[PDB]
Amino acid sequence: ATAVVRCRTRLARRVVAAVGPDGLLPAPCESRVLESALALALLTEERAEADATARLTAYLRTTLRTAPPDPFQCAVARAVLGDAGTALDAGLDGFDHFTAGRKRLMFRTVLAALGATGFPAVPWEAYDTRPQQSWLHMEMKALKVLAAHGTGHPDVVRDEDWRALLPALEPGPAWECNNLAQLLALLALRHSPRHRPALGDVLKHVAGRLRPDGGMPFIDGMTVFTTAAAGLALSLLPAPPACVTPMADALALRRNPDGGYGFHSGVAQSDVADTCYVLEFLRRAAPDRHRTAVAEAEGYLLALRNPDGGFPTFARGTSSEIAMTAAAASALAHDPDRREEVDEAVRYVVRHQRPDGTFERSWSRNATNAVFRAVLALTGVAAHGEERRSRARAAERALAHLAATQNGDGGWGHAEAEPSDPISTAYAVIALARGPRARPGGPLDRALAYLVERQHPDGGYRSRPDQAGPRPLLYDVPALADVFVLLALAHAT
Ligand SMILES: CC(C)=CCC/C(C)=C/CC/C(C)=C/COP(=O)(O)OP(=O)(O)O
Ligand SMILES: [Mg+2]
Ligand SMILES: [Mg+2]
């Protein structure tokens, strides 16, 4: 067959082979400078785990020399190994997101907690946040506590502030698989005499999480998101492998009581991104076998829908997001009874397209992610008459943005002038596969050639990561590179 189909075949064999007999595709997160620095600061202050603190120090120095992250994370590591405001401004350089204000408060307080800068002179209510993702409440309370103690006003802390941190004292892996949240909570809790009896045992478990490279990962893993995305890719192949059934089973039995899905095993917080990938996959691979899970996931999404027609990530009443809205539109469009919500979601996407054809960055730090989600919703939901024209024009502007910013090597990076990476290019390919038929030398043709060229001898892909959290800080789940390139090649062939 073609080189693209040969490439797709080798990648599919590799992805199938990586799914375990439990139906899951393992998806560990790499060490990250931020969490490693916080783990270092916590263990150092507590004079615990000398072996672990030495490896963390070595990891941080090695990473800073050989693979330095964004300026904020570098400043954090330098603070702990020892222009903070300059690093904040550079790390949040034109971070254009509805959370920007919260993020500047958070990151500044992190740096101040580590002695790199002064604490923000804000009313304590600045740290108050409406209920959203479970662990976010804990992080904000931990930073409020650190600021109260750091500025010499410990009496400001109320019992309801401490109560928010109690999950950090539970044994075993971090609550909600989030090491950042537990590390921040523990840095705060070590200032409380009445919480100190529980600290010793958790510090031993923290220290036992170090990866072989001596670092601490952001999260314990991302196996639900990764397995669902890979199942979807595999289900779009001409003859899907048998393993889609155990993958569908493994996902369905992990559904949360609200009918949605978290990003990893043991994550009780559901989110629209995970849920939409699971729903799309189950719809194709197990619509009868898992009829009830499908219906519960649709019900989960509908109960999150915001009044403006968009969907938030975690909680109704937090800002709708374009990529989440497009994802939910595509995931809900399989039931003609949901057409009203689907159409309102697609209209939300069209209203929020930018004058240059783009949408926005959120959980992905490239522009191509939201383009691909938007284009799938704009072209996958059937529409006719005036509405067909409106959606086709918006999809055309998005695909034109892709063509206009395509790098000479045929790929795309995180931004118009960045070097190409396979993941960013994979998202663009999914979108462009909704455009005109590929032609020799055309944008889709060239993008597929780039992907063919970048395939490693072992059949896989190595890519700069695109996932951020907390936004805009990147974290690296290497398993996603193979999965999203496979999803692109499955869409494009
Ligand atoms: C699964 C997926 C890729 C979709 C997006 C949401 C999500 C569950 C991401 C997985 C990584 C993670 C646990 C970060 C939490 O972000 P945060 O709470 O630190 O983010 P914020 O501070 O920017 O709100
Ligand atoms: Mg957060
Ligand atoms: Mg977090």
What is the DSSP annotation of 191-213? T-GGGGGGHHHHHHHHHTT--TT
Q: Are 269 and 135 in contact (CB under 8 A)?
A: yes
- Which tokens in the block code for residue 21? 């007999």
User: Which residue's CA is the nearest one to ligand 1's atom 7?
Assistant: 263
User: Which residue's CA is the nearest one to ligand 1's atom 11?
Assistant: 469
Residue 293 one-letter amino acid: A
CB neighbours of 389 closer than 8 A, spacing ≥ 6?
A: none
Identify whether 216 is part of a domain.
Answer: no
Q: Are residues 287 and 389 in the same domain?
A: yes
Identify whether 487 is part of a domain.
Answer: yes
Cα distance between residue 134 and residue 314, in whole Å:
9
Mutate to test the pocket of ligand 1, among 274, 304, 324, 480 (most ligand atoms within 8 A of CB): 274
Q: What does the buried/exposed string (b/e) look like for 234-273 if buried means 16 or more CB atoms within 10 Å of the residue's CB?
A: bbbbeebbebbbbbbbbbbebbbebbbbbbbbebebbbbb
Cα distance between residue 299 and residue 321, in whole Å:
19
Cα distance between residue 121 and residue 345, in whole Å:
40
Q: Are 489 and 425 in contact (CB under 8 A)?
A: no
Query: Which residues, judged by CB distance below 6 Å to any ligand atom, belong to the binding site of ligand 1?
Result: 99, 133, 136, 178, 219, 225, 263, 271, 273-274, 313, 363, 467, 469-471
User: Which residue's CA is the nearest one to ligand 1's atom 14?
Assistant: 469
Angle value at C-alpha 163, between 123 and 473, nearest 5 degrees = 65
Cα distance between residue 192 and residue 188, in whole Å:
8
Torsion, Cα 264 270 276 279, to 10 degrees, reads 80
Decide: residue 90, CB within 10 A, 0-12 exposed, 13-18 middle, 19+ buried: middle
Backbone angles phi, psi at 27, to 5 degrees: -145, 65
Cα distance between residue 467 and residue 423, in whole Å:
10
Distances (CA, A) of 425 to 306, 371, 406, 428, 458: 31, 11, 9, 5, 20
Q: Are residues 291 and 160 in the same domain?
A: no
Q: Are residues 142 and 231 in the same domain?
A: no
Q: What is the CB neighbour count within 10 angstroms for residue 50?
A: 11
Identify whether 158 is part of a domain.
Answer: yes
Length of the chain: 493
User: Which residue's CA is the nearest one to ligand 1's atom 19?
Assistant: 470
Identify whether 215 is part of a domain.
Answer: no
Q: For residue 393, how far is its CA from the centre of ligand 2 (angstroms)?
A: 36
CB neighbours of 426 closer than 8 A, spacing ≥ 6?
A: 451, 484, 485, 487, 488
Cα distance between residue 358 and residue 391, in whole Å:
14
- Which tokens in the block code for residue 292? 């009830």
Residue 127 one-letter amino acid: Y
Tell me the three state secondary structure of residue 29.
Answer: coil
Q: For residue 436, how far is its CA from the centre of ligand 1 (angstroms)?
A: 34
Residue 112 one-letter amino acid: A
Residue 199 one-letter amino acid: L
Cα distance between residue 264 and residue 268, in whole Å:
9
Q: Are 483 and 490 in contact (CB under 8 A)?
A: no
Atom of ligand 1 nearest to the CA of 180: 19
End position of a domain, from candidates 162, 177, 207: 207
Residue 27 one-letter amino acid: A
Report which of 95, 98, 105 is spatially closest to residue 128, judged by C-alpha positions: 105
What's the half-sphere exposure (Cβ side, CA atoms, 13 Å) at 61?
A: 7
Identify whether 212 is part of a domain.
Answer: no
CATH of the domain at 407: 1.50.10.20
Q: Are 370 and 362 in contact (CB under 8 A)?
A: yes
Kindly give the residue spans of alpha helices, DSSP state H, lying in 46-133: 50-66, 71-81, 84-91, 100-113
Please name every residue paired with 405 in a beta bridge, in sequence order, or none if there are none.
none
Residue 100 one-letter amino acid: A
End position of a domain, from candidates 176, 207, 238: 207
Q: Are residues 333 and 362 in the same domain?
A: yes
Atom of ligand 1 nearest to the CA of 102: 22
Q: Are 183 and 26 in contact (CB under 8 A)?
A: no
Q: Are residues 91 and 238 in the same domain?
A: no
Torsion, Cα 304 364 20 18, to 10 degrees, reads 150
Tell me the three state secondary structure of residue 294.
Answer: helix
Cα distance between residue 132 and residue 153, in whole Å:
27
Cα distance between residue 26 and residue 29, in whole Å:
10
Q: What does the buried/exposed string (b/e) look like for 159-191 if buried means 16 or more CB atoms within 10 Å of the residue's CB?
A: eebbebbebbbeeebbbbbbbbbbbbbbbbbbb
- Which tokens in the block code for residue 401? 């943005």
Q: Are 182 and 174 in contact (CB under 8 A)?
A: yes
Q: Are 211 and 30 in contact (CB under 8 A)?
A: yes
Q: What residue has token string 């951020």?
A: 468
Report which of 264, 251, 457, 478 is spatially closest to residue 243, judged by C-alpha positions: 251
- Which tokens in the block code for residue 392? 């086709």
CB neighbours of 117 closer than 8 A, spacing ≥ 6?
A: 84, 85, 108, 111
Torsion, Cα 96 97 98 101, to 10 degrees, reads -70
End position of a domain, from candidates 162, 178, 207: 207
Q: Are 289 and 250 in contact (CB under 8 A)?
A: no
User: Which residue's CA is the nearest one to ligand 1's atom 4?
Assistant: 273
Angle, in degrees to the nearest 10, between helices 443-454 and 422-432: 150
Q: What residue has token string 């596969």?
A: 433
Q: For residue 365, how far is its CA from the centre of ligand 2 (angstroms)?
A: 16
Q: For residue 363, how far is its CA from the centre of ligand 1 (angstroms)?
A: 7
In which element (H, E) is residue 232 found? helix 223-235
What's the half-sphere exposure (Cβ side, CA atoms, 13 Å) at 465?
A: 19
Q: Are residues 188 and 242 in the same domain?
A: no
Identify whether 283 is part of a domain.
Answer: yes
- Which tokens in the block code for residue 426? 């994979």
Cα distance between residue 35 and residue 454, in whole Å:
31
DSSP at 155:
G
Tell me the three state secondary structure of residue 252.
Answer: helix
- Which tokens in the block code for residue 247? 């993958």
CB neighbours of 254 closer than 8 A, spacing ≥ 6?
A: 224, 261, 262, 265
Q: What residue has token string 């390919």?
A: 429
Report which of 362, 363, 473 is spatially closest to residue 106, judged by C-alpha positions: 473
Angle value at C-alpha 385, between 384 and 388, nearest 5 degrees = 55
Atom of ligand 1 nearest to the CA of 272: 4
User: Which residue's CA is the nearest one to ligand 1's atom 10?
Assistant: 263
Q: Domain range holding 186?
A: 34-207
Q: Are residues 73 and 99 in the same domain?
A: yes
Q: What residue has token string 């603070």?
A: 79
Q: Are residues 20 and 134 in the same domain?
A: no
Q: Are 398 and 371 in contact (CB under 8 A)?
A: yes
The total number of structural domains in the chain stands at: 2
Q: For residue 337, how far is its CA from the centre of ligand 1 (angstroms)?
A: 31
Q: Are residues 85 and 143 in the same domain?
A: yes
Cα distance between residue 135 and residue 92, in whole Å:
22
Q: For residue 416, how far is its CA from the centre of ligand 1 (angstroms)?
A: 24
Q: Are residues 449 and 407 in the same domain?
A: yes
Sign for the CA dihedral angle at 239, 245, 250, 255 comes to positive
In which element (H, E) is residue 473 found? none
Q: Are 345 and 325 in contact (CB under 8 A)?
A: yes
Q: Are 398 and 375 in contact (CB under 8 A)?
A: yes
Q: For residue 470, how far is its CA from the centre of ligand 2 (angstroms)?
A: 5
Q: Are residues 98 and 191 in the same domain?
A: yes
Identify whether 48 is part of a domain.
Answer: yes
For ligand 3, a single-atom ion, which residues have Cβ within 5 Å? 180, 470
Cα radius of gyration (the chain): 23
Angle value at C-alpha 224, between 218 and 489, nearest 5 degrees = 105
Helices H / strands E in the chain, number of each: 21, 0
- Which tokens in the block code for residue 251? 């996902």
Q: Are residues 469 and 439 in the same domain?
A: yes
- Which tokens in the block code for residue 428? 């663009």
Cis peptide before 470 (omega within 30 of 0): yes
Report which of 50, 45, 55, 53 is spatially closest to residue 199, judged by C-alpha positions: 45
Report which of 448, 446, 461, 271 is spatially closest to residue 362, judged by C-alpha positions: 271
Q: For residue 265, how far is its CA from the centre of ligand 2 (angstroms)?
A: 19
